[PDB]
Amino acid sequence: QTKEERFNPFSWYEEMRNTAPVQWDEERQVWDVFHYDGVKEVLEQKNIFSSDRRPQRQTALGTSLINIDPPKHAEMRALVNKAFTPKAMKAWEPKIARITNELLQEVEHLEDIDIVEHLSYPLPVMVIADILGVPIEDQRQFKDWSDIIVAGPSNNERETLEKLQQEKMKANDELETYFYRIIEEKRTRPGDDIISVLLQAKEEGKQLTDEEIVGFSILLLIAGNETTTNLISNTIYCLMEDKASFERLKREKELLPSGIEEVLRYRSPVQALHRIVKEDVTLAGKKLKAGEHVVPWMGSAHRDAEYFEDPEVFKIDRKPNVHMAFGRGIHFCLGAPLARIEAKIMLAELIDRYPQMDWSPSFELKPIESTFVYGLKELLIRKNV
């Protein structure tokens, strides 16, 4: 399938919603769930559809929020919830604006810029590194590691697969090794960051192993390299694709939060997730069995015509917009407030500064090679100042 099509899975989504919104895929050995209500039930019904990824060695990543079920999930989420509320995140608006204007300043001398390299990717890893309290100087190791962990394979063969899994194991092992070192440093001289806050809470007897702190830290770091960058760049993509939306947005700046919500629906940074059936369940007439894997495609739910009038049309003012781009239920994204404010601040600045931006003459579509993570490796824009 050409790159063009891998950036447009929405035709396959449509085809499945209108034939079998829940179906077992022999090749990939999963139940695909494509319709809105099904994606919602899968994500919500945590006692039916489990988040525990059972591999034969567990990783620290496998003990973090995203891979644990109740009761362990609520106790662990509770320790970190207050650090990521919309109010907690208002303190960071000024740092984000400063970081945005710093990065913009560095490529001011360029007529043509890569949104991804110069803007959408640096800002979120700089925030997450300040949140974790690790040296931004390691950003290259952070991206290479995070890229492996979210990477997808070229094909479904047993030997391309087997070799990717090997790289992910090595990258987990090196990510763990790295953070165990950080954890010792921060026991010696703590800092103002969430690794210390967690360590301070383990001091005080909260049920918390150092492996659990490492895993959470790795989850955050990976989120800081592989999510908000695609919201921002995918937003610019939609605005360059439909210049009518871009012209309206420039005239009505108050539409930017709404426009970012519609990008979340329409070019979702995360197209799907993974669950495991805990006990036999029936779902749209299909007989799901204990232990089978399930893939709810939020990207497809987001085009479901019964919930989104004219699903195929990008509407910056879309109302209602009840998307599940950040999930649904007890695992709903922890960084959603942070993501929303990182995107608003950098996008507003970009649009204010380069109202005549357009595709660079060397632009090429370069979709990310992943099945879940959805975005572009590169987005070359001509400023036209």
Ligand X SMILES: C[C@]12CC[C@H]3[C@@H](CCC4=CC(=O)CC[C@@]43C)[C@@H]1CC[C@@H]2O
**Of residues 59 and 235, the one with the C-beta less far from ligand X:** 59
31's contact among ligand HEM, ligand X, none, with CB below 5 to 8 A by partner kind, is none
Q: Is 333 in the site for ligand HEM (CB under 6 A)?
A: yes
Number of residues that bind ligand X (CB under 6 A): 10
Q: Which stretch binds ligand X (CB under 6 A): 86-94, 177-185, 223-231, 297-305?
A: 223-231
Q: Is 368 in the site for ligand HEM (CB under 6 A)?
A: no
**Of residues 183 and 298, the one with the C-beta less far from ligand HEM:** 298
Distance CA 70, CA 243 (A): 46
338's contact among ligand X, ligand HEM, none, with CB below 5 to 8 A by partner kind, is ligand HEM
Known binder of ligand: residue 17? Answer: no
Q: Is 225 in the site for ligand HEM (CB under 6 A)?
A: no
- Burial (CB count <10 Å: 0-12, 13-18, 19+), residue 275: buried
- 229-248 residues in contact with ligand HEM (CB under 6 A) are 231
Output the smallest distance, CB 271 to ligand X, in A. 9
Q: Which of 302, 335, 375, 379 binds ligand HEM (CB under 6 A)?
A: 335
Strands 293-296 and 30-33: parallel
Q: Is 222 in the site for ligand X (CB under 6 A)?
A: yes
Q: Which of 39, 208, 214, 223 binds ligand X (CB under 6 A)?
A: 223
Q: Which of 126, 283, 325, 381 binds ligand HEM (CB under 6 A)?
A: 325
Q: Where are the alpha helices (DSSP H) in 189-304?
A: 194-203, 210-226, 228-241, 243-251, 256-266, 298-301
Q: Is 256 in the site for ligand HEM (CB under 6 A)?
A: no
**For residue 209, which phi and psi values (nearest 5 degrees)?**
-90, 155
- Burial (CB count <10 Å: 0-12, 13-18, 19+), residue 139: middle
Beta-strand ranges (E) seen in the chain are 22-25, 30-33, 49-50, 112-114, 275-277, 281-283, 286-288, 293-296, 358-359, 380-382
